[PDB]
Each structure stands twice: as structure tokens, then as C-alpha cells.
Write a protein that binds this ligand. Structure first.
Ligand SMILES: Nc1ncccc1OCc1ccccc1
Ligand SMILES: [Yb+3]
Ligand SMILES: [Zn+2]
Length: 606
């Protein structure tokens, strides 16, 4: 049972196809049109069904060319309102019908952000983008909003003619809108069955540049050239992903670089990955996020978690493939360096939540929990830790990558549970069952806190980061003079970040140490968002008032939750910046992404 969905379950009826016909109304901040759902009964004598909705206005529901009865139920908080439809004729098992729903979205849709022209790069045109994961699709259109159901889709989207529409689908042409010559209709086809959380839309002043045989980069013109360079490894990473995972089935692999308020590093929308502009470091150093999004083309998009309780299946396998792609590109010592970094990130997560907290379990129970509230590094890093440990238990990366390919193959176009994964693991490694039987499954899958066993990690690239961090932590005032710009001489940007992550784990440091770091290392000058993020965190946590405006600026000039949430949190916890932090949030709140606005609000207890 999917405890995040109010719709009829897959055992009752299945959506097979969505045809979406809509217009994007920027003056009203609404999407208006029709969702025609092709629905297959899984039951005998089916007379009604329920769909998820959230903040939708339903005009009418039509089956066989006649309006039918429906009802919207009481709102259930973040789940929205169940929509029961009365079918005009009882269906037998496997019978399919088309249900056409006339709807309009609300300006407050939790799936959508609408930006004024001034919130964009060009300053001339407004911009819309969606983000449906986990359960925000109901906020765009009525649907069985559960990843246990996979469907194909087609769409025609009417937009102001000077603007461009894109979706998580193959572009299927454009014409002027016969009903309004100030408009264009963009058309789309997604013929690979997908969970509805993968439905995506952007409308804006978009341009494109080709960067590979099957990849265009899209953004506002101001960002095109930089994006093309930053993401040029994309094809090389695809070929590696295909070798590890099997054929890329989705046709194109385009990238869209969003405006700065996009809430995540990336979103694996099929045919069109969405990424944050915080990746634009200028040197391709944040490309693991591309490797990650590519990897989802197999783990997540082909093999899908059945409910959000098993999100780790999506994230853990993706991070595992991610790290392999980067290891292939940059060497096994680097994969290990990043693997160990992730364990670091997990200690952070477990420390923040508390070692007994329910969100630190690998498999969570989302009954009455908002997924956006439960969301964290845990499913990513505890999932990865599990796989890396199993990798080391069963004979190394070559062997376990055999399993990953078999696993993807076995479960393509399907939605699965942790038990499905574990069943197949045991079947695949039948001759290694005794060894599999040594794993403390109950602790790994169901217990809170750090895993019962830490994997083995090569230390090569990590040592210098630990060594420098230890020098700073153990230093007294008369040692500060010994620190010097040349300390960083042989460290890559990755290592600079790990050094800062190491140090941040022991924060606060004395204020004088942190001032000295700025003096000798000039971290204030680094634009790499991962580094700047951790450095500003260390500064605020060490009570440096100078850093207050820098932290406020980064928190608000971009909206990647990864960065924005802990920066506001740090600023709220520093007494000198507490008032300004609350004030700043309150001022930006209306113009933020709705999910980000919601979470920063809870975070700040405002
Ligand atoms: N939030 C979650 N926490 C633990 C397991 C699964 C989860 O899924 C919810 C989710 C996924 C993606 C985006 C937002 C929320
Ligand atoms: Yb001393
Ligand atoms: Zn992911």
C-alpha cells in the first residue's frame, strides 16, 4: 500500500496513458486544460475510482462524450484532496476507458514556481518550471500519484509565442495556436512508461546548444556558453553508464539549466534532466551531479521504487553508479575518496536527526509523514554504504556490477520493493548465500543510526585533507603564523571541499583561527558553491560577523535547498544574525519556491 497517495491502488485500476492538453497562463499563474487518462481496470465490475489532486479546480469530467459525476473529498494536508469519479458503465477486468478531466491549477501549486521577468536572467520574460517528485504531480493534474503505476504520455502545451515549452519527453513539433495567434503550441511524446513523478515542464525564454551526439544544453541565453563547457563530459558519462547499465532507452539526453531557485542539484526528468546553476563552477568540478542524473536513466527511471518508503532503491543504486562513472573517469582512488566523503555526510545526517530517529532508517515508513519533510542524505548515503559493503563482501566492483546490470534488466519498466531487491540479490548470488546470510539485514534495512558495519575505504586522497584539518583544529594562536597559501598547493577543489567538510565537523573553531584561514587561504574568493557553502557555514558557526552578509547573500541569491536550508538554520542559530535571518526569509518568502518556502519556514520555526 502507498501511504502517500489517496488514489485507487494499482491492484484496482492502472493508468496506461496521459494525454495532456493545456495552456500556461502567466497573467493568472494557472495551468488550464484537460488531462485525458487512459485507465485499465484490474477488477471485475469496477464502477468508481479515486485520483489524487491538490489545489486543483475541477470544471468537469467526461466519459464517452458525456459529463459524469465526481466528488472532491476533504483536504488531507500535504496529500491534497481525493477525487472520486463515478463511471457511467461498470468495467470488467482489463477493460480500458478514457476519462477526460477539465481542470485548472492554483497559483499556489506546490509542484510549480512562477517567476516574474526580474527573477530571470533576461529580465524581459517570465518563466515557469515544475518539480513533481515526490508527490507534487497531483498539484498539476489529477492522477494516480504513486510510483507503483507507470504510463506513457503525450502533451500539447499552449504558451506565449515568444517563449519555449519543454517537457520530459521527445519534442514533437510546434505550430501557432489556432485559438490565439499570440501563442504557440508545443507538442511532446513520451513512449517509455514512466511513474507520474517524472512528468516535467518548463516554459521560458530558452535557447539551446548541442554538446554531444544526443545532448542539447538548454537555458536562458545568458547561461548557454558556460553550461556547454561545464557539462561537456555528458556524452562520455553516458557511454560509461550504458556499459554499466545496458542500453540507454530514452532517445535523447538533454540538460536544462534552471534559474537559481530550483530546489535540487538535479532532477532526473526523462529526456531532459533539470540541474541547478550552482553547478556552474567554471571547471566541471561538480559534474558528479550529471553522472548521478544520467545514472537515474536506469536506477529510478527504469527500475522504480514502488512507494516512497523504498526511495533508497532509487537513490542508493544511483549514487553507486554515479561513483563508478566518476571512478572510471578519474580512477578508483577517486571513487573511494568520494565514497568516504559520503560516509562523512551520513555521520552528519545521523548526528543532525539523532541516532534513534525514524528518518535514519534505510527503509522508512511515510504514513502521515510529508516526504519533503522526511527527505535527506540518508537514503543516498546509507543506501550507498549498503551497496559498497555488499560489493566488498561479494568479491569486488567487477562482480557487483554484474549484479547491478542483471538487476536493471530484471526490473526494467517495473516498480519494486526492498524485498524484491533482496529476493533478486539472493537469486543472483545463489552460490554466495552463506556470505549474504552474514549481513545483519534487520539493522541495515530497518534500524536507525549509522550502519552496523563501516566499509573499507582507500585513504590516499583523503589523508592530506584530514592532516590539514587536524593542524587547524589542534593549532594554538602561536601556530597560526605557520599556516600559509602553499598548504593548498597540491589539493584539488575536491580535496579543498573535503578539508572544509572535515573542519566543519568540529565547528566552532576559535574566531581567530577562521580569520587566519581567510587571511592565508582567501576562501571568500572561491565561487565553487560546495566549497563556499561549507566555508560560510564554518564562519557563521564560528561566530564571524563579517560572514553574516555573505551567508545571507548566498542563502537568497540561489535556492538549492541543500545550501539555502542550512545557511538560514546557521544564521538563525547565531544570535548576531538571528533577527536579520528571520526578516530576510519573511521578505523573500512570497517569491521563493513553495516547497523551499515551506521547509525554511519550519526550519526557522516561523
Ligand atoms: N523523503 C524520503 N525520505 C526517506 C525515504 C524516502 C523519501 O522520499 C520522499 C521524497 C523523494 C524525493 C523528493 C522529495 C521527497
Ligand atoms: Yb604553542
Ligand atoms: Zn537521485
Amino acid at each position: 500500500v502507498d501511504t502517500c497517495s489517496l488514489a485507487s491502488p494499482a491492484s484496482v485500476c492502472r493508468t496506461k496513458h496521459l494525454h495532456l492538453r493545456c495552456s500556461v497562463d502567466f497573467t493568472r499563474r494557472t495551468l488550464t486544460g484537460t488531462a485525458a487518462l487512459t485507465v485499465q481496470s484490474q477488477e471485475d465490475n469496477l464502477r468508481s475510482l479515486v485520483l489524487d489532486t491538490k489545489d486543483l479546480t475541477i470544471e468537469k469530467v467526461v466519459i464517452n462524450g458525456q459529463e459524469v459525476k465526481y466528488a472532491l473529498g476533504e483536504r488531507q494536508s500535504y496529500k491534497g484532496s481525493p477525487m472520486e469519479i463515478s463511471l457511467p458503465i461498470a468495467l470488467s477486468k482489463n477493460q480500458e476507458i478514457v476519462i477526460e478531466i477539465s481542470f485548472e491549477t492554483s497559483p499556489k501549486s506546490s509542484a510549480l514556481q512562477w517567476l516574474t521577468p526580474e527573477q530571470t536572467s533576461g529580465k524581459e520574460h517570465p518563466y515557469l518550471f515544475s518539480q513533481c517528485q515526490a508527490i507534487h504531480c497531483r498539484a498539476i493534474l489529477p492522477c494516480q500519484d504513486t510510483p507503483s503505476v507507470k504510463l506513457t504520455y503525450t502533451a500539447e502545451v499552449s504558451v506565449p509565442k515568444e517563449l519555449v515549452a519543454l517537457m520530459s519527453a521527445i519534442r514533437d513539433g510546434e505550430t501557432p495556436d489556432p485559438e490565439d495567434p499570440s501563442r504557440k503550441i508545443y507538442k511532446f511524446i513520451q513512449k517509455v512508461p514512466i511513474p507520474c513523478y517524472l512528468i516535467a515542464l518548463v516554459v521560458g525564454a530558452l535557447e539551446s546548444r548541442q554538446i554531444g551526439p544526443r545532448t542539447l544544453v538548454w537555458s536562458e541565453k545568458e547561461q548557454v556558453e558556460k553550461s556547454a563547457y561545464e557539462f561537456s563530459e555528458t556524452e562520455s558519462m553516458l557511454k560509461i553508464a550504458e556499459d554499466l547499465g545496458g542500453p540507454y532507452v530514452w532517445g535523447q539526453y538533454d540538460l536544462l539549466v534552471l534559474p537559481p531557485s530550483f530546489p535540487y542539484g538535479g532532477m532526473e526528468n526523462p529526456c531532459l534532466t533539470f540541474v541547478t546553476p550552482t553547478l556552474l563552477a567554471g571547471d566541471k568540478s561538480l559534474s558528479n551531479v550529471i553522472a548521478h542524473e544520467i545514472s537515474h536513466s536506469w536506477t529510478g527511471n527504469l527500475v522504480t521504487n514502488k512507494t516512497w518508503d523504498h526511495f533508497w532503491l532509487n537513490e542508493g543504486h544511483t549514487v553507486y553508479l554515479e561513483r563508478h562513472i566518476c571512478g572510471r573517469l578519474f580512477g578508483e582512488k577517486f571513487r573511494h575518496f568520494n565514497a568516504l566523503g559520503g560516509w562523512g555526510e551520513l555521520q552528519n545526517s545521523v548526528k543532525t536527526f539523532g541516532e534513534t530517529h525514524p528518518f535514519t532508517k534505510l527503509v522508512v515508513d511515510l504514513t502521515d509523514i510529508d516526504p519533503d519533510v522526511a527527505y535527506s542524505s540518508v537514503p543516498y548515503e546509507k543506501g550507498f554504504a549498503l551497496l559498497f559493503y555488499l560489493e566488498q563482501l561479494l568479491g569486488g566492483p567487477e562482480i557487483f556490477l554484474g549484479f547491478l546490470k542483471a538487476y536493471v534488466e530484471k526490473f526494467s519498466y517495473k516498480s519494486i520493493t526492498t524485498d524484491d531487491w533482496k529476493d533478486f540479490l539472493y537469486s543472483y548470488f545463489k552460490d554466495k548465500v552463506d556470505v549474504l546470510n552474514q549481513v545483519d539485514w534487520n539493522a541495515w534495512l530497518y534500524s536507525p543510526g549509522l550502519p552496523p558495519i563501516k566499509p573499507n575505504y582507500d585513504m590516499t586522497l583523503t589523508n592530506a585533507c584530514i592532516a590539514l584539518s587536524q593542524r587547524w583544529i589542534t593549532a594554538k594562536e602561536d601556530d597560526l603564523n605557520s599556516f600559509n597559501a602553499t598548504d593548498l598547493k597540491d589539493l584539488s577543489s575536491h580535496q579543498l571541499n573535503e578539508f572544509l567538510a572535515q573542519t566543519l565537523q568540529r565547528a566552532p573553531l576559535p574566531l581567530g583561527h577562521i580569520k587566519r584561514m581567510q587571511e592565508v587561504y582567501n576562501f571568500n574568493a572561491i565561487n565553487n558553491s560546495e566549497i563556499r557553502f561549507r566555508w560560510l557555514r564554518l564562519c557563521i558557526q564560528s561566530k564571524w560577523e563579517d560572514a553574516i552578509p555573505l551567508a545571507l547573500k548566498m542563502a537568497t541569491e540561489q535556492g538549492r535547498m541543500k545550501f539555502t536550508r542550512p545557511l538560514f538554520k546557521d544564521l538563525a542559530a547565531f544570535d548576531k544574525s538571528h533577527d536579520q535571518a528571520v526578516r530576510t526569509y519573511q521578505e523573500h518568502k512570497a517569491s521563493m519556491h513553495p516547497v523551499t518556502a515551506m521547509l525554511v519556514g519550519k526550519d526557522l520555526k516561523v
